[PDB]
Symmetry: D2
Subunit: 191 residues, 4 copies
């Protein structure tokens, strides 16, 4: 039976398992440290390709709304130019499930060479990106069916980036709320 109802049920369970297995690997003390490192960055570059780039863009819009200076761009050659322009104290959040896309590895190498802090969000595998990162947060898609592998992967990745966002709101709550209110007031003027 391959009805749409069966497909939906199996996909929801697949996503639940990705959330659970990703959450199970978190070191919460290490996560609080990473959040503090991000909060101090004068500039944050979020890198990625394909589905990882969309996860990165999703995080980037939220961070920009609450006042962070963020670079996040799909063009891989532009991404490389930003990575080499990073400074000590800046942060790169490198989102790559495989950790082995040449463009993203190159951006991480360039960021690290400039003295920036590299935080990888990547699968539980021994990848070039994991070897370059100062800190790694793990994303586990679980055992997925081929038609939905990319969707459960994205679900797992968003569980990590979403938690980073909430942690950053927690650290600067008053200003975050002020910026959320100003943003809502502005977009309502476009109704």
């Amino acid at each position: 039976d391959d009805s749409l109802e069966v497909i939906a049920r199996k996909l929801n369970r697949e996503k639940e398992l990705a959330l659970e297995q990703t959450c199970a690997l978190l070191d919460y003390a290490r996560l609080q440290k990473i959040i503090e490192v991000i909060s101090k960055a004068p500039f944050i570059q979020i890198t990625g390709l394909g589905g990882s780039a969309l996860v990165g863009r999703d995080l980037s819009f939220k961070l920009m709304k609450i006042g962070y200076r963020v670079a996040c761009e799909a063009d891989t050659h532009v991404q490389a130019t930003v990575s080499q322009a990073l400074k000590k104290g800046d942060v790169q959040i490198a989102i790559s499930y495989s950790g082995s896309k040449k463009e993203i590895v190159l951006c991480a190498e360039a960021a690290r060479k400039q003295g920036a802090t590299v935080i990888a969000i990547t699968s539980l595998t021994d990848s070039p990106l994991r070897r370059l990162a100062h800190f790694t947060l793990d994303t586990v898609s679980g055992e997925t069916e081929w038609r939905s592998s990319s969707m459960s992967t994205r679900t797992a990745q968003n569980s990590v980036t979403d938690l980073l966002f909430v942690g950053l709101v927690q650290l600067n709550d008053v200003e975050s709320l002020k910026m959320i209110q100003r943003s809502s007031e502005l977009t309502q003027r476009l109704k």
Copy 2:
């Protein structure tokens, strides 16, 4: 207690409830019809703003990989120009949780005027977009905490678009698999 572990646990449950409540509203017979309508479209425009635009882009990349001709662009004025260029038999997938963003409503009005079929992916509310759509698929975020409302909304929206994608693969399985293989072979050449 507002520790990161508590936050992660509550957020995962919030997402689970969004998946469940969205799934509970599906009319599977109506969904199969919508999938067939999409499969026949010579051109598909996926519209949206903000987080909905990212959900749309996520679907657009998958549909393009399996051979669909898709327009999906963030610039709202460009979106309007595409909507008025649609033809009878083309499909607009209008993604808007509120269903009341002026730009997205305008695009749906323009598409409908040209004779295109409008499928709305929207919250369970009485919005201008829902009144313009030929078919509506409901997305329910559930009762969310303010720090994560947009994330659970996105989770609910992706549950609908992901199901559309799997349904479309199901309808043209051989060609979808061929295109997935060619795509994987090409990107591996960029390693």
Copy 3:
């Protein structure tokens, strides 16, 4: 003397020379043929990276407004997935000054393998892209100063894409004017 007034004067002359030298190479009979080929394409993919991707996007928005079904995306891995999904009769407009960016060459190889027609917009050099293209339109930046090389290159590239756009309007003038009017009416509703 390196005053801003001197810089502006020299840059305008550099752009004038790029327009002139690019125009001087055009075979107008071959250009009319290319325009006809584009006009018949059920789907057009415009590829490119960096500055060439922006030139491509600029053309893509105009073509979409006048009714063409166009793919144009910065992410190089997404571009590859679109190229392998092209069909016989579809057209790829491959914009690359060097003609030797691996990602763009790969997209042209994939498009040609599927039977699509490849039109390269590229410098007057013996590049892999020029060897893969069914038709090539030349772009000459001229001898440029290092601070403005990319700007005069873009000027030369836009001179070719702009001419393609005008030629396509010429071929379907009534419908183009109708679509321009509908588009203007819609965007004015967002004032």
Copy 4:
């Protein structure tokens, strides 16, 4: 006679006149001041829609390569969220030929309210954007034919942004050259 050769000749002359008429309005002392203001900005937001957004993106990529922290995004609601997050000393470069697109005016109002410096790049008309800007740089398309109005407008706009870029390179030449070299070395590794 409406041959492609005649069209190309007329379009090149139209672009030459746009460059000339835009250049003729520059106050070079005021321009040097604007360049200095930009050079000191901890964060720069470049706003715009449609063709102006592409001009902005073109400038943004160059500024990011030479070390500036820049926001530049097509989604108008995201643009609004960035504008309200700007700080005193930050700069908004608001690119709008008409100066009367509601979204761009709103972003300029929000930036000014936060204490940021607003530099408008706009036509020689009495627009809401010109009334909000601390400094305005004029862009003149000249008298254009309807098929090419947007192209000559873009040419005029790029003449201003290109001059800003060269002026900024001039102010920090050693670091700009270092960043250009690192960027070229990195992208060559992707060949």
